[model samples]
Structures are given as C-alpha cells and as structure tokens.
Target: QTSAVQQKLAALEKSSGGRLGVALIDTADNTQVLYRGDERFPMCGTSKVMAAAAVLKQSETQKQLLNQPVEIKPADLVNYNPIAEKHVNGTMTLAELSAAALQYSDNTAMNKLIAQLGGPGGVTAFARAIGDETFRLDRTEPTLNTAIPGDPRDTTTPRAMAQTLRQLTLGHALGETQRAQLVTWLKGNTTGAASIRAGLPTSWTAGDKTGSGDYGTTNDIAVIWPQGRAPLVLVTYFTQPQQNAESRRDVLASAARIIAEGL
Candidate 1:
C-alpha cells in the first residue's frame, strides 16, 4: 500500500508542472518532510488562518465577546460579491465574521476584523505573540478589491503553517481554552476541496484550512484522527500556473487520500 501510494503521489507531483510542494508530519512520532516547489508563492486566502489566529488570541487575552455585535459598514464590503444580489449590509458578531472568514473565505468580513484588530501591525504582533514567525500579515490597500502585494504578509511555507496548526491542536501554541476555540473556528470552514475531508467519516471531526489563488495554487493542512487511533497531520500544496481549478482540486484530493491511507 505504501509503495503504490508513493507511486501515485509521484505521478501527481509530476503532473503539477513542477509546481507542487508537499510536507507531511506525523507529529505523534516526529516524522516529517520539507518540500520546496512553489513554496514561496503568495498565500492568497490562506492568510485567513493567521487572521483567525490573531483574532482568537486577542479575544482570549482581552475577554472580547465573540458573539457580540460588530457592525458591517461600507468599507467592509471589499471583495467582489459572487452573490451580489443577496448582499445586504448589517451587523454580525465577531464570531460570525470569524466563521465567514474561515468557512466562506469572506474577504470583506476579514478586512473589517483586521481593521478592528488595529491593521497590519496587529496581525504581525499576533504572529509574534504566537511564535509563528514564518506566517505574516501584510498591509495591503485598505480596500475590498485591492490585492495583497508580494511584500510583508504575502508568503507562508507549508510546513510552517502546518506547525502552527499542530501547536494549536496539541494545546501547545495557545492556552487550553484558546486552543479549543481555535479548533471550533477552524472546523467552521465550509468552503474547501476534499483534501482534508476525504479520508475520514463525518462522525470524526477534522480541523483544516485551505488556500487557492490565480497563479494555479492550492494548499491545505489539517490534523485529523478518529477516537481510538493516533492523530495525523497532513499538509499538501500544489500549483500549476495554468491548471484548471477542478483539476487542481482532483489532484490534491487524490494525493491526500493516498497519503492518509499510507498512514
């Protein structure tokens, strides 16, 4: 099984046009890999992970109400709304924005929360507080349609981000309560491919974050386990500057399933 899975993984990697980089770590036993292909590509929506982390940490320290009302003003409406007709401006709790950022990748909600968190400086401060130096939050134009430039908050390595999740799940990065809250928020992510969600039954919960962008990149990381077996962490990143979205998702899910079974 291991040999066959490895073969399929190799084939998929090849098909990625040399754009996929994967790192898997069985943290329970200290097994890992560091991959480099397209590792430095801008993180795209994956930056939401850092944003969520920052918010959670702040909430823990400041005793802010996650469910308290947070108004959505015109500035918060940044991203091009796919469901524009359904869009209505109103108020939602900080908790709702966190869920929207992770589950739906709501750009407007994220930008608003970042503003409340005190902008890019707050994001960077949160990273330092959590001891995650590799993941950064950059200062992009404070608008909904602007791009996050390839500067301050524009990059993250697969292994580093996976490690951040590892620390959170293991209750080592944040305090016990904060860790639990982080897991709850991550599990709320509703929009994503099958990479992390494919292997496990719905009864067994999995915490994950996925990111994709225009230059043909898809990245996913998760810590998954059933009630009795050992816990597992998987991180997969793939890029094909011209690959179709469905094809990229297919490749990632295939690789993830193969990796899961191998364990």
Candidate 2:
C-alpha cells in the first residue's frame, strides 16, 4: 500500500513547479518523508535559528549571561526589521535581541548577534560543529550580495536543517534551559503566520522560523506538536527562479496543510 505521506509529498512536488524541497521527520517514530531533501538552498532568515544556538553556546562557554546588555546603533538598522524599528537607538539584553531576532525575524537584531559571535565565520563554524554541514554564513543579515551569482549569502539543505532542529529539540546541542528559551521564542514567532502556522490544526502547536529572499526563496522549519501524536520536525524550502512571492508562500501553506492533515 502507498503511504499517505508519500502521496502528499508527491502531490506537493508536482504542484511546486519542481522548486520545492522538504524534510519531514516523525520524532516519535523516527521516520522521515523527503523530497529533494539533500538539495542545497538559500537559508535566508531561517539561518537565524542556527545563529541563535551559536549565541547561546558562546554565552555558556564564556560564562556570560544572556541578559548581557548590547547597544543597537543606527548603523545596525536594516530594511525589513520590525524589531529594529522599535528598538533602534536603544539598549537591549542579548537574550532580548535573540528573542526579537527569532520572533520578528529582525534583521538588525540578528546582525548584532552575529557580530557577538565573531562574525559570519563564527556562525559557520558553530553550524559545522553541530552537524549542519550544508550551512554557510557568508554574510550578515539584510544583505543580498553573494560570492556567486544566484546563490544566497547563507545556504543549507532541508535535511541539514531538519537534523539541526531534531538535535536542538532532543537536547543534544544546548542545555535544557537554553533550549527551552529558544523554543519559546520560536513558538511565539509572529512572522510567517500565513504560512505553515496557518495550515496547522488548531490543536497543533509549532515552534518555527521562516525566511524569504530574492528569486522566490521562501523557507520554514518547525518542531510541531499535535495533540495525542508524536511531535514532528518539518522543513520546507522553495528556490525557484522567476517565481512570485505569493505563489511561493501559497505552495508552503499547502504543503504544510498536507503534512498536518496526514498526521
């Protein structure tokens, strides 16, 4: 018999103009559903989660508090940041900035955190240590310039991202307290409300991060909990050239709904 998960993934692939990649893992059963799962794609803001983990690790290693205060300067401002809009020219703790970065997809806040970790190379090193081989943090947030044309400054594979989420959820990379804090920020994330979160059942809750970039790059990764079922880790990516933003988002919402209903 054909698996329902396979059927749903097949349909999603067909409708996505061949521009989608997915990695869905049932943490309870240790099973996965994948499509173009190993393909590399621009991570965009979804890279924030990995960056956040790096920050937490650095803080722990240095014996520093996440509440260590940091200043947000005017030069740190970015175009698409709601957090910066509110907190620009002000002071916030490292923990507060991290929360804003994940919850609001705040580009400026992310850039600040990246600097705290010793620049892009620091983030790349941290990701490598944690088994996310495909990720490279070549530039800070809110930048479109890439070393190669049509490539994003930051990139990763769906499988790599899903694995990272799984490790974080399982307490492999961070302490329980820090992991809980990160999960809380993700669960409270208000960005991308119309995408994966919109497609989930009311009883289901997700801690997710979303990303969007040039050339129709739209992505999301989530640790989802469905009442009476095993928790799931879902990663979805779209990297089709010449595609419109709305279409990319709609595809994501549909794919998410398929996974939700299948569960």
Using alpha carbons, what is the TM-score of model 1? Answer: 0.81
TM-score on alpha carbons, each prediction = 0.81, 0.90
Kindly list the per-residue Cα lDDT of model 2 for residues 88-145, writing each as its tens digit.
6788788888888899888888888898889998999998888777888888877732
Off by over 4 Å in 1: 1-8, 80-89, 139-153, 199-204, 243-247
Best by TM-score: 2
Q: lDDT of all predictions, in order shown?
A: 0.64, 0.79
Error of 1 at 123 (Å): 2.0
**Cα shift from native, residue 215, model 2 (Å):** 1.2
